[PDB]
Amino acid sequence: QIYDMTSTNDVEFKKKIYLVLKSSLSGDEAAHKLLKLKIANNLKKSVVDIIIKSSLQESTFSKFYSILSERMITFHRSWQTAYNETFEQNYTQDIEDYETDQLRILGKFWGHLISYEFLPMDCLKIIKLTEEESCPQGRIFIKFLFQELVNELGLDELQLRLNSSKLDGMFPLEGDAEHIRYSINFFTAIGLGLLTEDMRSRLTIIQ
Amino acid sequence: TEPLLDILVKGETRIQNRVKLGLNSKMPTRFPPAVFYTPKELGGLGMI
């Protein structure tokens, strides 16, 4: 066989999704044109990547790419897995490349889908707030994530979802008070400290 | 606004007809969208 060191099959397909994306007016229009293509299930992970990268060329968040992605998820469940695989793939791998102007786009992007339950709160369990397993640009991404959570839902509605989330990544309770001192310090730096009332009760008992 | 989108269609196609009136043929196949929308640096009209 002749070895394939180039991906010209992918580049032509990557061009076609980008042309679809730029030829539409509304978010429902581009959502129609992507679902018209009947993309095979192996490429539906890659199509989500093309949407997100072209959402970073915009230099500002747009509600286009949200309502584009919302009509994907409600159509068929393999789209919904494709965003759930991408959100892990973005946070665990792609944060090291992205500038801070691109992180405010993504934190507002994924914060829109999480706050309207297109992604569950359980996808936030992957994200963990330590000193070791955090990026400085990863802390920027979380900060722009929670602001879109605060702005859409409100501070009390966010409090209810984080209590039903039962996650450990943002919320250490079982011990390791250096992480509890870390997590109170990080959330108050964002501007949200009303949710940290659980940790301060846990911290002074350790003292 | 739905009515504005209709005026954008009817408006842009009148401009394309003005070129198609300039040449003596209003035919569709004679004027592929490459004619109107190619930028001026390549010889097209540069229509947006």
Partner: peptide, 27 residues
Amino acid sequence: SYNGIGLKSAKGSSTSGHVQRSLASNN
């Protein structure tokens, strides 16, 4: 079929009048 959606005619529309269902809006 023409279910109340579309144009009275494609004559003065300057379009083809081609109507396709939004695959995005289902639920």
